[PDB]
From a paper:
Here we describe bNAb 1-18, a VH1-46-derived CD4bs antibody that exceeds the potency and breadth of most classical VH1-46- and VH1-2-derived bNAbs. Notably, at 2.5-Å resolution, the 1-18 complex is the highest resolution view yet obtained of an HIV-1 Env trimer. Both complexes contained three 1-18 family Fabs and three 10-1074 Fabs interacting with three-fold symmetry with a SOSIP-Env trimer.
We selected antibodies 561_01_18 and 561_01_55 (hereafter referred to as 1-18 and 1-55), two representative members of clone 4.1, for further analyses. Both antibodies are highly mutated, with heavy and light chain V gene germline nucleotide sequence identities of 68% and 78%–79%, respectively. To determine binding of 1-18 and 1-55 to the BG505SOSIP.664 trimer in the presence of other HIV-1 bNAbs, we performed competition ELISAs and detected interference with 3BNC117, N6, and VRC01. However, compared with these VRC01-class CD4bs antibodies, a different binding pattern was detected for 1-18 and 1-55 when tested by ELISA against several Env proteins. For example, whereas 3BNC117, N6, and VRC01 bound similarly to YU2gp120, YU2gp140, and BALgp140 and were reactive to the V1-V3 loop-deficient gp120 variant RSC3 (Wu et al., 2010), bNAbs 1-18 and 1-55 showed lower (YU2gp120, YU2gp140, and BALgp140) or no (RSC3) binding to these proteins. Compared with the epitopes of the CD4bs bNAbs 3BNC117 and VRC01 (Lee et al., 2017, Stewart-Jones et al., 2016), 1-18 and 1-55 bury more surface area on both the primary gp120 epitope and the adjacent protomer, another potential mechanism for their increased breadth and potency (Chuang et al., 2019). Finally, the slightly higher neutralizing activity of 1-18 compared with 1-55 might be explained by variations in glycan accommodation. We detected no recurrent mutations at contact residues of 1-18 or typical CD4bs bNAbs, and pseudoviruses derived from these sequences remained sensitive to 1-18. These results were confirmed in an independent repeat experiment for 1-18 as well as for 1-55, another member of clone 4.1. In addition, whereas some bNAbs demonstrate binding to self-antigens (Haynes et al., 2005), we found no indication for autoreactivity of 1-18 or 1-55 when tested against HEp-2 cells.
Residue numbers in the entry:
A (entry chain K): 31 to 57, 66 to 77, 81 to 140, 149 to 185, 187 to 309, 312 to 321, 321A, 322 to 398, ...
B (entry chain H): 2 to 35, 35A, 35B, 35C, 35D, 35E, 35F, 36 to 52, ...
C (entry chain L): 1 to 27, 27A, 28 to 107
D (entry chain J), E (entry chain Q), F (entry chain C): 519 to 546, 569 to 663
G (entry chain R): 81 to 127
H (entry chain G): 272 to 309, 312 to 321
Write the structure that this text describes.
């Protein structure tokens, strides 16, 4: 009985780190829910440790491709907007207006082909300031993204609201889920669970903020890789949601035209009402309390007497120096610089943010391809939660007491790293090896 | 393969310089190089060690400056996804030297999350006198 | 701020031996964020090594080097006439990054 | 009665009776080829483990016995410290670099068993 | 000498000698993805039934025996009225709602036959 | 210690000990559908041979014994000339036309054994 | 060919509910446009 | 030499030499390349 022999065991709870292919499960149309597996049933584990680590996972980098391929699939069979690149005779609509909106809302006229190729059609439309570029009385403007890209009109039948989907694993793989109250990026998890697939993950597109995301526990927690390093973004997560309200009070008109045989084009009509500017309202008291709470949370890493100073953005393109999101089918760009005022020392109104509208957008830097945004008829409103901010800090010398913090980011994976941080794909192996006193017969 | 920057411009004290560092020279090209790769700008004075000047991210051209050259350095790219620029206002007779632009993944790629400047491009010279 | 210094500033060697390019760090480098560059006067400064010890694409078998903590060494196996040029080491981490001063090999 | 992967943090002496909850779940447009790639990989990963257990004389069993002696160079641990304290995850990390020889050593115990029985059956 | 699915209407006592023709036919552009799904689905449907028979101690057999007793609450019929008058289609409809309780009960008889045989072989 | 397909020209009496190296290597964009068909074809070709060996009472074994006698009309060669002189490639060409009758005669020996064992175990 | 006859068995056959007459209706309209993809698009005829 | 049949003059004759013999050719013109934009998003590189 002393001479031990080796035995193999089938169906043994042991796993390894591996990457695999996740599929969709979610239960007119949207970009995602067209062909997915119809869907809880969790299993809790006890006193087993696991080294959870984000920013090196294989789930936030597969989703970054599974979102852009799904976006290209919803943009391929639509109408290709080739003949729009003509000379646009374009002047200022609503002249001598003493309001703020002066440079935008330009009226341009151009020729467009119809179903009969020998005949043309003169059409009138309104385009924003970020949609027309002058080229060398009325001036002759052209499109913004024509000389380096080919714009395609998006399909008006599909919608752009984020339907919550689930990334689900096949047989042989599992998803470890950390169920800790406080949990930073890299480290052990005291209580894990084995899940097939997760809760509602909203694939919302947003920069400089985290709209309609998952909530947190009773305390605000910050997350970074090596936060003394000022190169990685700081993914904070608020404990209570703060609401932002913005509408578009100009009454819209959407007019239809036929550019060719079988195709269609929905363009901007007139404005029947008042020429106003869209603006997002936030409550000042709870936002100031949230800023004080996240400053008190961030003060646990840099001592007591260090002056934390919130500042505005650095610059670059429009998707970092402003905040961009998607409301109902329209893409907004608001400056949000009224939320990062003067600094913080230890010893009933509403804040408005001016927000503009750009039709031609270019998401995920697809060179050679661009999408057109059709207008939405009527007044459209959007109320949104804010669960999480995107902050980064700068460097400095040794004698520096004013630690600055600017809202940057811009990475689309950071919006999916605040909702897939507590999940980890894992591959189980059913072959176990153990010695015992057993011996087979002859 | 290699990056391309041109310019042998002389300058006067009190002006601004513009250095464009493009990848694949033909203008109508879609390299996609300025798209998933960070880009470092590095100055070097003759008889002096080279110092860092500024990195630009490939996500939406969000720049990260240093504290020495903060208030007088703007840099971004145009509407096309090539040809990042370098505008250094507030000149001085101290920064006379060569300039370099290098490609760097900066730990954002899929294999191994490395930290290396795999290719440097050209190297222009900026002098200033009166 | 971590200052990066190099004590062998002037070096001279014959073609066909091993040379040691040492570098001292200030306070506790992370042993995975360091790079070496081969500079020259009016040429293209290329890279020779990744991190601690990992070769690049255009790098032969004769280039290597290791080190951890605050000391980092570059160990060239053999000396060629196409390698007599100055070398510059740099680190990574918090902005701004700082180079390692400067060293130079020579023929004698 | 623990569930799928329920005894992963338990003792190896207590996890040897719940081997069926992990052995029965190994088999159970853009997404047209995404869902098809997993149904081939799971079947291949199940069939590889079924082929590895078929050439050891353990095809159809969960806890089988072999004639290969356990060497002391792989692990110097006794019986009272493995099946009473260690879990199945801590034991796999100790013999992780010895899997490629034992899987060879379990092969020669098969061909030396089927041949020496074969001339026993020809008499 | 009946053929594939030839004894589907015969007696269960006479259809137990022709189980081989139903167990050997389970494995044997627009149409590029249509033909590829069938070769995955048939392999998966065969491997599911091969996995369900491998964890019951019946891997490699057709008519095996178990130790689970037959409860009288499922059916009150005797041996003389099942294997002499009823076919398989009329028998499958009578115990169609008791399949999920037998398939678990056949599982716990495996480890109970595997654990008690383990320590008997360790002596 | 020969390798994969190393004993292909060797003696059948000497190649019967190296049956492990051939039984373990059966499992291990324009090219997106080209690589997907090959794994499905390999899985089907492995599962067909695993199904043919599971209905003969030889599941999990490499060298098994059957009850079907060897007819003299298939080959008139003795034992001293088959396992000493001929290889497997020269032997497969001699019974290349008598495969489907041996494959049919091997199927009834499973049922004629299983029914008798079921009648013996019912007492 | 190669048919197999059966005895002593009845089956509840039912048309207007089968999944074969609704799969063929999709397979025909999915094969109709496949023979029109490499052909010439008749765009400039509408004069 | 290799062929399907030597006496059949319809099949090709593939020969294989024992030593590699070199062949050098250049294009001695400079052949500058110019570009033009043919439409939205495309490119056209023509002869200079
Ligand atoms: C973060 O999350 C929050 C969630 O809290 C998001 O906020 C919501 O965002 C959605 C975006 O889709 C908003 O939905 C839109 O609401 C529009 C306003 O309609 C409301 O007012 C009318 C007034 O009569 C009510 O009737 C509506 O009630 C409807 O819903 C209830 C639900 O029970 C039904 O019972 C009713 O019968 C109504 O059906 C709303 O309260 C609304 O117009 C809009 O609907 C258009 O789009 C859909 C999808 O395409 C069409 O099916 C529909 O017919 C509408 O179509 C328009 O365009 C076509 C173009 O041809 C025209 O022909 C039509 O006439 C019409 O003009 C849509 O449903 C929602 O209001 C909003 N708030 C709340 C509290 O839910 C944030 O957006 C999100 N932030 C992000 C993602 O950044
Ligand atoms: C994140 O970045 C920080 C800052 O670079 C890293 O901390 C550094 O860690 C090293 C050890 O790997 C420390 O070096 C040690 O220094 C002491 C003397 O101070 C010496 O006695 C030791 O033998 C060792 O060399 C270094 O001091 C430390 N730097 C700071 C500022 O604390 C850290 O490793 C990085 N990674 C993480 C947190 O995962
Ligand atoms: C967002 O708001 C800020 C603050 O109002 C704007 O910053 C102004 O920028 C101009 C440009 O030179 C300065 O002359 C002003 O002094 C700045 N304002 C203040 C109060 O300092 C900024 O332009 C706005 N827009 C964007 C896109 O950031
Ligand atoms: C494509 O068109 C855009 C829009 O005009 C060009 O962007 C402008 O380029 C000029 C070059 O003299 C700059 O002065 C402007 O500041 C640019 N406008 C911006 C950045 O909004 C772009 O250069 C064109 N691309 C070409 C010709 O390749
Ligand atoms: C984990 O919990 C189980 C019962 O829940 C217990 O038997 C076991 O000893 C525990 N392990 C440790 C290391 O405490
Ligand atoms: C449309 O074409 C006619 C043809 O001559 C031209 O006169 C007119 O100016 C064009 N329209 C615009 C807006 O340029
Ligand atoms: C995460 O939190 C734990 C708990 O205090 C700590 O030990 C660990 O160092 C933290 N890791 C990081 C990267 O902040
Ligand atoms: C925003 O909209 C919500 C919707 O109910 C409303 O309760 C709230 O008063 C509005 N204003 C602010 C400042 O939150
Ligand atoms: C924000 O909250 C703090 C609470 O510490 C309070 O002192 C301060 O007056 C509030 N308002 C502003 C504008 O900081
Ligand atoms: C900063 O102040 C808080 C007050 O609660 C204290 O707990 C903490 O220890 C202080 N930080 C340092 C580094 O002393
Ligand atoms: C923030 O508010 C203060 C209050 O007076 C104001 O002075 C400052 O200009 C504001 N910040 C911005 C960016 O407008
Ligand atoms: C906008 O214009 C339409 C056009 O008929 C009108 O019916 C509607 O009342 C107007 N106002 C709003 C708020 O939609
Ligand atoms: C914001 O969060 C609260 C928290 O429960 C939720 O009730 C509300 O619906 C959220 N608002 C949204 C999703 O617009
Ligand atoms: C079918 O039924 C008849 C009488 O009902 C019986 O004689 C016969 O054996 C049965 N089976 C077949 C295969 O005909
Ligand atoms: C060609 O021939 C030379 C010398 O005969 C040889 O060195 C070389 O490897 C050959 N192949 C190529 C591709 O140059």
């Amino acid at each position: 009985a002393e001479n031990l022999w080796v035995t193999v065991y089938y169906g043994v709870p042991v796993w390894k780190d591996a990457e695999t292919t996740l599929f969709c499960a979610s239960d007119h149309n949207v970009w995602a829910t067209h062909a997915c597996v119809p869907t809880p049933q969790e299993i809790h584990l006890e006193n087993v440790t696991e080294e959870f680590n984000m920013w090196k996972n294989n789930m936030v980098e597969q989703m970054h491709e599974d979102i852009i391929s799904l976006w290209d699939q919803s943009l391929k069979p639509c109408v290709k907007l080739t003949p729009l690149c003509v000379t646009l005779q374009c002047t200022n609509y609503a002249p001598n207006l003493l309001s703020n909106m002066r440079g935008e809302l330009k009226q341009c006229s151009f020729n467009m082909t119809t179903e009969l190729r020998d005949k043309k059609q003169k059409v009138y439309s309104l385009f924003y300031r970020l949609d027309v570029v002058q080229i060398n009385s009325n001036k002759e403007y052209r499109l913004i993204n024509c000389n380096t890209s080919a714009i395609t009109q998006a399909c008006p039948k599909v919608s752009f609201e984020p339907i919550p989907i689930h990334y689900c694993a096949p047989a042989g793989f599992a998803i470890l889920k950390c169920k800790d109250k406080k949990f930073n990026g890299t480290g052990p998890c005291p209580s894990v669970s084995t899940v097939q697939c997760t809760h509602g993950i909203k694939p919302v597109v947003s920069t400089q903020l985290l709209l309609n995301g998952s909530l947190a526990e009773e305390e605000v927690i910050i997350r970074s890789e090596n936060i003394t390093n000022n190169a990685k973004n700081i993914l904070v997560q608020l404990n209570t949601p703060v609401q932002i309200n913005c509408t578009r009070p100009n009454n819209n008109t959407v007019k239809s035209i036929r550019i060719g045989p079988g195709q269609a084009f929905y363009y901007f009509g007139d404005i029947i009402g008042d020429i106003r500017m869209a603006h997002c309202n936030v409550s000042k008291a709870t936002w100031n309390e949230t800023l004080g709470k996240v400053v008190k949370q961030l003060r646990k890493h840099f001592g007591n007497n260090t002056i934390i100073r919130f500042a505005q953005s650095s610059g670059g393109d429009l998707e970092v120096t402003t905040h961009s999101f998607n409301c109902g089918g329209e893409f907004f760009y608001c400056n949000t610089s009224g939320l990062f005022n003067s600094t913080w020392i230890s010893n009933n109104d509403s804040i408005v943010l001016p927000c503009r509208i750009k039709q031609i957008i270019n998401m995920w830097q697809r060179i050679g391809q661009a999408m057109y945004a059709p207008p939405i008829q009527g007044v459209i409103r959007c109320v949104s939660n804010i669960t999480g901010l995107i902050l980064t800090r700068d460097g400095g010398s040794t004698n520096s007491t004013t630690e600055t913090f600017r809202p940057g980011g811009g990475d689309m994976r950071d919006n999916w790293r605040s909702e897939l941080y507590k999940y980890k794909v894992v591959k189980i192996e059913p072959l176990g090896v153990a010695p015992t006193r057993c011996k087979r017969r002859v | 393969g290699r990056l391309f920057q041109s310019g042998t411009e002389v300058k006067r004290p009190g002006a601004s310089v513009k250095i464009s560092c493009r990848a694949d020279d033909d203008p109508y090209t879609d390299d996609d190089t300025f798209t998933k790769y960070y880009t470092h700008w590095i100055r070097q004075a003759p008889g002096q060690p080279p110092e860092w000047l500024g990195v630009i991210s490939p996500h939406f051209a969000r720049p990260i400056y240093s504290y020495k050259f903060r208030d007088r350095l703007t840099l971004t790219r145009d509407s096309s996804l090539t040809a990042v620029y370098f505008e250094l206002r507030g000149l001085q007779p101290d920064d006379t030297g060569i300039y370099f632009c290098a490609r760097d993944p900066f730990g954002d790629m899929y294999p191994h999350y490395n930290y290396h400047m795999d290719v440097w491009g050209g190297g222009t010279t900026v002098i200033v006198s009166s | 701020e971590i200052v990066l210094t190099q004590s062998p500033a002037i070096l001279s060697v014959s073609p066909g031996d091993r040379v040691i390019l040492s570098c001292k760090a200030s306070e506790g480098l992370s042993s995975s964020d360091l790079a070496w560059y081969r500079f020259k006067g009016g040429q293209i400064p290329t890279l020779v090594i990744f991190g601690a010890s990992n070769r690049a694409r255009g790098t032969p078998d004769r280039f290597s080097g290791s080190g951890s903590g605050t000391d980092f060494t570059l160990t060239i196996n053999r000396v060629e006439p196409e390698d007599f040029a100055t070398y510059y080491c740099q680190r990574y981490g918090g902005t701004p990054i700082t180079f390692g001063g400067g060293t130079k090999v020579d023929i004698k | 009665s623990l569930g799928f992967l329920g005894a992963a943090g338990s003792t190896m002496g207590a996890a040897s009776m719940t081997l069926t909850v992990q052995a029965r779940n190994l088999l159970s447009t853009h997404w047209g080829i995404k869902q098809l790639q997993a149904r081939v990989l799971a079947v291949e990963h199940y069939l590889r483990d079924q082929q590895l257990l078929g050439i050891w004389g353990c095809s159809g069993k969960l806890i089988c016995c072999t004639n290969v002696p356990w060497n002391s160079s792989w692990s110097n641990r006794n019986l009272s410290e493995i099946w009473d304290n260690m879990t199945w995850l801590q034991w796999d990390k100790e013999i992780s670099n010895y899997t490629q020889i034992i899987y060879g050593l379990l092969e020669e115990s098969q061909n030396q068993q089927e041949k020496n029985e074969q001339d026993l059956l020809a008499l």
